PDB file of C-alpha atoms in Angstrom:
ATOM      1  CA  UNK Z   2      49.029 166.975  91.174  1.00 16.00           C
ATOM      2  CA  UNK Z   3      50.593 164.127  88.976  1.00 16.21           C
ATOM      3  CA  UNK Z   4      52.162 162.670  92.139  1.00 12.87           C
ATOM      4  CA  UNK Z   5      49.181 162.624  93.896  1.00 12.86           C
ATOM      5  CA  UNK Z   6      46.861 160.922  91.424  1.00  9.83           C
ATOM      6  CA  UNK Z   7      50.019 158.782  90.308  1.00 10.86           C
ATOM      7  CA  UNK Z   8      49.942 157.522  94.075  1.00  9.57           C
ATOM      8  CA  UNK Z   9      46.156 156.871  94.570  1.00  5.69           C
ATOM      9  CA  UNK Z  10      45.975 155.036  91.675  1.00  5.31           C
ATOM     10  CA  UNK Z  11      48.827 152.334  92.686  1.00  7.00           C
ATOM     11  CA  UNK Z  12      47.599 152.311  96.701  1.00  4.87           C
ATOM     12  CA  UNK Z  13      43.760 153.049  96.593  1.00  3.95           C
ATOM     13  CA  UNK Z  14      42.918 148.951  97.423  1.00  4.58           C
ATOM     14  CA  UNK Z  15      45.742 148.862  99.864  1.00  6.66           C
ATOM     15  CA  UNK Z  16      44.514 148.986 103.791  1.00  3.64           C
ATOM     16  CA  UNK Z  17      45.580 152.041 105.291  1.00  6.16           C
ATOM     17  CA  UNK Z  18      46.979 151.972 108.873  1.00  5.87           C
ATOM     18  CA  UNK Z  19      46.883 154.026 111.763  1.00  6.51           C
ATOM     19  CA  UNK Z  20      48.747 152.986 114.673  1.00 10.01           C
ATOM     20  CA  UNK Z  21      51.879 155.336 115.342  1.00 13.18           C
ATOM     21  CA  UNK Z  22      54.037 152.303 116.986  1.00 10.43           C
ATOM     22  CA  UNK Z  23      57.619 151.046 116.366  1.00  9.02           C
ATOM     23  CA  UNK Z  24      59.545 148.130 117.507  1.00  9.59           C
ATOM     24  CA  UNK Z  25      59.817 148.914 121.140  1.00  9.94           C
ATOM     25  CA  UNK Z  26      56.256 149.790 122.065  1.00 12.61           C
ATOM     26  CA  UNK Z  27      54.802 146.949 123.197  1.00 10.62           C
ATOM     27  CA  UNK Z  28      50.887 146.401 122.649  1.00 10.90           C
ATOM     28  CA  UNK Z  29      51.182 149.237 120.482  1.00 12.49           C
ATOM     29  CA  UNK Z  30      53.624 147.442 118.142  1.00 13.04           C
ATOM     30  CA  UNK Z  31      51.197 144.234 118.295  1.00 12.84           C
ATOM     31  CA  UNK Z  32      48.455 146.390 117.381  1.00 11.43           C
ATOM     32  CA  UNK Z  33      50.710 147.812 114.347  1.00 12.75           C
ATOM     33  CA  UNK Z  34      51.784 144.386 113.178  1.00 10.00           C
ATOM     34  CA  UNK Z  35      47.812 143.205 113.013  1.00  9.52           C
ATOM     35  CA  UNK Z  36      47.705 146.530 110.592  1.00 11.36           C
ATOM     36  CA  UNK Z  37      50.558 145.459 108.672  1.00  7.48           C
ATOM     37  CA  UNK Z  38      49.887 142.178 107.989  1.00  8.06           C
ATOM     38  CA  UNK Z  39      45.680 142.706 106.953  1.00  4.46           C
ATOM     39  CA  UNK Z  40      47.612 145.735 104.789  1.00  7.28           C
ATOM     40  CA  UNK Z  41      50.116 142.797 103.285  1.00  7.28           C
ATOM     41  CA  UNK Z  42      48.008 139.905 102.817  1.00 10.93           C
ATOM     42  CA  UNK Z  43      44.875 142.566 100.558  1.00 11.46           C
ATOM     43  CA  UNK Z  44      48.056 143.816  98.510  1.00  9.26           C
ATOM     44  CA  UNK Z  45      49.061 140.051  97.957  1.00 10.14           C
ATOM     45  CA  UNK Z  46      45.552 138.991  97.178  1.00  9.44           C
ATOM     46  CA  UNK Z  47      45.008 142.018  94.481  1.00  6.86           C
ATOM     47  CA  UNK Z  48      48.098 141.421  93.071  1.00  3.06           C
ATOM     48  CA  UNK Z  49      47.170 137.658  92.644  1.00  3.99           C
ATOM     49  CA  UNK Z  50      43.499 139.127  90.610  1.00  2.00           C
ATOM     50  CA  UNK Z  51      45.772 140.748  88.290  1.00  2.00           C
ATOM     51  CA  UNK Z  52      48.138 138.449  87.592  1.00  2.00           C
ATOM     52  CA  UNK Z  53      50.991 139.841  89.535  1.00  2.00           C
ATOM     53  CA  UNK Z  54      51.741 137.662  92.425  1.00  2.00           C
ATOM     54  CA  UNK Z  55      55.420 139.441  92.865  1.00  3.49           C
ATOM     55  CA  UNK Z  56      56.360 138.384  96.413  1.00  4.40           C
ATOM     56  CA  UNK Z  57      56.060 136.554  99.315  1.00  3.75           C
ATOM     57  CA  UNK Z  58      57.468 138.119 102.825  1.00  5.80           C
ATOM     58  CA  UNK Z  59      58.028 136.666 106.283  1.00  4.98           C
ATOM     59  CA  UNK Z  60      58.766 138.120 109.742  1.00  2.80           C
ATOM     60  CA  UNK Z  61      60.202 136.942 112.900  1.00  4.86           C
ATOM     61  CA  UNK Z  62      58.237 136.554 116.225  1.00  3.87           C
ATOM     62  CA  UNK Z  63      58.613 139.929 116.879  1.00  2.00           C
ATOM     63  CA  UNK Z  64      57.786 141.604 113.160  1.00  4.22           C
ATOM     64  CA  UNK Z  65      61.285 143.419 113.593  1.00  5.98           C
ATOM     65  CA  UNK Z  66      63.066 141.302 111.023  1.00  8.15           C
ATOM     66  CA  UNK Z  67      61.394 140.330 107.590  1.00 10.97           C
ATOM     67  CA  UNK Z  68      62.483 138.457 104.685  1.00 10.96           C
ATOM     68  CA  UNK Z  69      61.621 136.657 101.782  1.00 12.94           C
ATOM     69  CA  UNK Z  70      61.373 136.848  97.654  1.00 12.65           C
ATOM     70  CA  UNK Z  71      60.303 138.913  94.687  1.00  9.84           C
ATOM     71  CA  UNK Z  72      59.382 137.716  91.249  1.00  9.30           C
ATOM     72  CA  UNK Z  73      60.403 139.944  88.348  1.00  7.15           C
ATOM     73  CA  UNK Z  74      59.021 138.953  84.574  1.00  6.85           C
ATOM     74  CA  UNK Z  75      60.902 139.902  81.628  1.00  6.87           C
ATOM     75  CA  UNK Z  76      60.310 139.085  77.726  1.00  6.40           C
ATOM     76  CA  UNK Z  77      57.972 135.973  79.600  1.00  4.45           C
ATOM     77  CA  UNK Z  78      60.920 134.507  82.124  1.00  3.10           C
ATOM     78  CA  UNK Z  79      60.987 135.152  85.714  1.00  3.37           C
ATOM     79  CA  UNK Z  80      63.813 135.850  87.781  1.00  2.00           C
ATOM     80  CA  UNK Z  81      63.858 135.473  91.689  1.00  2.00           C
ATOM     81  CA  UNK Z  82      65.473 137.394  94.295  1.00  3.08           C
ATOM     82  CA  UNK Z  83      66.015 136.628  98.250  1.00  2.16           C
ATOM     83  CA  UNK Z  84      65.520 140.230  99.843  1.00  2.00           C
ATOM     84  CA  UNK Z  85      65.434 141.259 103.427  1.00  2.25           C
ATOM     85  CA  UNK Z  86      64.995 144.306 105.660  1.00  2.00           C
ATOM     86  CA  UNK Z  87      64.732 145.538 109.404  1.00  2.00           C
ATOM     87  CA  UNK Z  88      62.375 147.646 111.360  1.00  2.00           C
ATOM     88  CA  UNK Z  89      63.713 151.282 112.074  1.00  2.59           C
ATOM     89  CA  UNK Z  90      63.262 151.901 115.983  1.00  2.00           C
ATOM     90  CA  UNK Z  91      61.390 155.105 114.448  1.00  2.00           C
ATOM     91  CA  UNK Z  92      59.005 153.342 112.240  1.00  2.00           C
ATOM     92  CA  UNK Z  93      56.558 153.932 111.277  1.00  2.00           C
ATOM     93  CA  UNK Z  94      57.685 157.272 110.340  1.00  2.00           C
ATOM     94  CA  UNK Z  95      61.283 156.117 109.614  1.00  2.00           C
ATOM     95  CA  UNK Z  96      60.560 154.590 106.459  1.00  2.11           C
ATOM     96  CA  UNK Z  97      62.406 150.548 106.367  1.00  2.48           C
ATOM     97  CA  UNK Z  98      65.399 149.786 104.055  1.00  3.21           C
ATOM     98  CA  UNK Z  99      64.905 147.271 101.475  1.00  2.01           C
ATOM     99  CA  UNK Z 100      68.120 144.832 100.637  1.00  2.00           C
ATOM    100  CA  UNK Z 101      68.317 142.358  97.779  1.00  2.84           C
ATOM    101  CA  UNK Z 102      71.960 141.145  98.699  1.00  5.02           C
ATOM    102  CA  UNK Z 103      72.626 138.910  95.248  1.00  4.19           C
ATOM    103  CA  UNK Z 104      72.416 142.220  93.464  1.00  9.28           C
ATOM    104  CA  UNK Z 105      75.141 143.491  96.274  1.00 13.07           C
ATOM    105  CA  UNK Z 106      78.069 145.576  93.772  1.00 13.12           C
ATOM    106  CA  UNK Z 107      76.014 144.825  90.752  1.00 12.18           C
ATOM    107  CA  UNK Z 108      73.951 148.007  90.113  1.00 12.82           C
ATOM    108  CA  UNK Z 109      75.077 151.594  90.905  1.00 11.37           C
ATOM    109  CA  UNK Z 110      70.804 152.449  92.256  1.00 10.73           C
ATOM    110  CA  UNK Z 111      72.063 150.355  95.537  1.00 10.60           C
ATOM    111  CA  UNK Z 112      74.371 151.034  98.277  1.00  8.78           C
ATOM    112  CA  UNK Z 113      76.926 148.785  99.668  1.00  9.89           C
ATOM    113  CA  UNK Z 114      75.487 145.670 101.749  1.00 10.39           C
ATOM    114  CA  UNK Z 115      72.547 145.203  98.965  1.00 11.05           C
ATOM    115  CA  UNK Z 116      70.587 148.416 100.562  1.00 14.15           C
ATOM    116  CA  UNK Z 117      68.492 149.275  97.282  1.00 14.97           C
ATOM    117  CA  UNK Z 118      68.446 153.379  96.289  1.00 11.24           C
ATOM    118  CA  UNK Z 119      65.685 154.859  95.552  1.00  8.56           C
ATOM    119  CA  UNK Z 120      64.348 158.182  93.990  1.00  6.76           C
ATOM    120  CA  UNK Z 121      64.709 161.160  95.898  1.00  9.68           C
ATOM    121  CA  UNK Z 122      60.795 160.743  95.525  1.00 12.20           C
ATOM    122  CA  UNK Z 123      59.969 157.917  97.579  1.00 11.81           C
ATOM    123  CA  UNK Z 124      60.818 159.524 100.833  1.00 13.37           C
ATOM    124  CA  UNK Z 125      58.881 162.544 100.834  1.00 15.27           C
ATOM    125  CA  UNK Z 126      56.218 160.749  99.905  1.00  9.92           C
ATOM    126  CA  UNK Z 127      56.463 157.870 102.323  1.00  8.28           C
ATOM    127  CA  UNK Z 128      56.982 161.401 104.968  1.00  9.65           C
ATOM    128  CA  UNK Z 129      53.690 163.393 104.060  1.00  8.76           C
ATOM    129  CA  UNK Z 130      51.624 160.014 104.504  1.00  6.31           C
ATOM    130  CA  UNK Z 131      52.892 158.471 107.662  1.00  6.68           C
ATOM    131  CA  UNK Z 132      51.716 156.977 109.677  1.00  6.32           C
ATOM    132  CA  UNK Z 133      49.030 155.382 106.584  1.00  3.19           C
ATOM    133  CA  UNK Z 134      52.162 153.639 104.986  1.00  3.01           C
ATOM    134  CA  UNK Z 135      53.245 150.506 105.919  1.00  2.06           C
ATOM    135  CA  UNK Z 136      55.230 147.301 104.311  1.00  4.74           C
ATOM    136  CA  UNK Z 137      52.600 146.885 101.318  1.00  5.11           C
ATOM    137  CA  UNK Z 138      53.252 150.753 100.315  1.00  2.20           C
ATOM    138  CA  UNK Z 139      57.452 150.066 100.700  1.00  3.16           C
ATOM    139  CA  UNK Z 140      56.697 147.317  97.909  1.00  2.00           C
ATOM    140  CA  UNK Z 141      54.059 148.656  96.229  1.00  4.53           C
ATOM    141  CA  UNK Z 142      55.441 152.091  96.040  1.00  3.90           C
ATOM    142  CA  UNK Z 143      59.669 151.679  96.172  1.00  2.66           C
ATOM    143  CA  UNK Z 144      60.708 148.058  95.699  1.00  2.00           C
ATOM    144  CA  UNK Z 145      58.324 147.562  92.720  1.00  2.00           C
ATOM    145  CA  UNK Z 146      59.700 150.515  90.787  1.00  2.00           C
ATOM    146  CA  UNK Z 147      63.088 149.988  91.781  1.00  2.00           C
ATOM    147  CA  UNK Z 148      63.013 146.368  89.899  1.00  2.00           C
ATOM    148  CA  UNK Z 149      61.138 147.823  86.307  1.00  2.00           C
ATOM    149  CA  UNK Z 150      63.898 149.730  86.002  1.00  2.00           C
ATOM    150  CA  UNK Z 151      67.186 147.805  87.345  1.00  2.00           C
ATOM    151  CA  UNK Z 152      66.124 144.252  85.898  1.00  2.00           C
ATOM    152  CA  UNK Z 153      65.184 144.892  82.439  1.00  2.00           C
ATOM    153  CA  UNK Z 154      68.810 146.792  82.697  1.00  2.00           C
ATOM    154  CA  UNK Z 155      70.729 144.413  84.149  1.00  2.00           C
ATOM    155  CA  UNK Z 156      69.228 142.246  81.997  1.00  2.00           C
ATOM    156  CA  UNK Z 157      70.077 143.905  79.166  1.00  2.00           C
ATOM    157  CA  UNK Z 158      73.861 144.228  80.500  1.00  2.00           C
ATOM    158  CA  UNK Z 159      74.100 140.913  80.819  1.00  2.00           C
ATOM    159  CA  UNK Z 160      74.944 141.112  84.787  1.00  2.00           C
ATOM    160  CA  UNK Z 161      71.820 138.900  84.961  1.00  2.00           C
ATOM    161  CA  UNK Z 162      70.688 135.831  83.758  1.00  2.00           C
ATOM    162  CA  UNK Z 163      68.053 133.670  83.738  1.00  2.00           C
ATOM    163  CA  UNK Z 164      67.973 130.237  85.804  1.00  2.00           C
ATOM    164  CA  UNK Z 165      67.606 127.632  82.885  1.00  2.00           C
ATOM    165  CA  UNK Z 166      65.589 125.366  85.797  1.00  2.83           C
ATOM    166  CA  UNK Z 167      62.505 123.123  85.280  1.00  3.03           C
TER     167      UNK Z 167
END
């Protein structure tokens, strides 16, 4: 299959996971989080080897709320947007819901409260790999091509511009 190589080729240096734990399942879930986060910080350190540092992401205490910001370069500027997004109670096979609120009414691929929309292709594909997905797959695999699509066309429709800061 396309799909299949199209996928391998985008996640093969990613850290696969293992643990089937959510938010309410106690060492479990700790165990999970340790996944998650070696998973996060590889995909952040690969992306920095190829020049494309795109985000940095936070959690609280209890890895059920994270937040934080994604880079997006177009024609050599970079424009930088706050997203956010909760833990399902039925992740990890629940796949999480990615918000960038500034965009919130500004693109018709979102749903109302900033909730970005993805392809009817993400999900089955985050379905037949769970649990081995986690929060480096959501980026790697839905937020990133979510934003080289909307940007450059947002750009383009002048519903963004570029923060003329030093």
């Amino acid at each position: 299959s396309m799909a299949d190589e199209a996928t391998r080729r985008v996640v093969s240096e990613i850290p696969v996971l293992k643990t089937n734990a959510g938010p309410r399942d106690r060492e479990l879930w700790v165990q999970r989080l340790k996944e998650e986060y070696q998973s996060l910080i590889r995909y952040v350190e690969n992306n920095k080897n190829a020049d494309n540092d795109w985000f940095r992401l936070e959690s609280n205490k209890e890895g059920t709320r994270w937040f934080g910001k994604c880079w997006y370069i177009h024609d050599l500027l970079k424009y930088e947007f706050d997203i956010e997004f909760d833990i399902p109670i039925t992740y990890p096979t629940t796949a999480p819901e990615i918000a960038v609120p500034e965009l919130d009414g500004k693109t018709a691929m979102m749903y109302r409260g900033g909730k970005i929309c993805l392809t009817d292709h993400f999900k089955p594909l985050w379905a037949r790999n769970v649990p081995k997905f986690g929060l480096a797959h959501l980026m790697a695999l839905g937020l990133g091509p979510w934003l080289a699509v909307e940007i450059p066309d947002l750009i383009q429709k002048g519903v963004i511009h570029h923060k003329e800061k030093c």
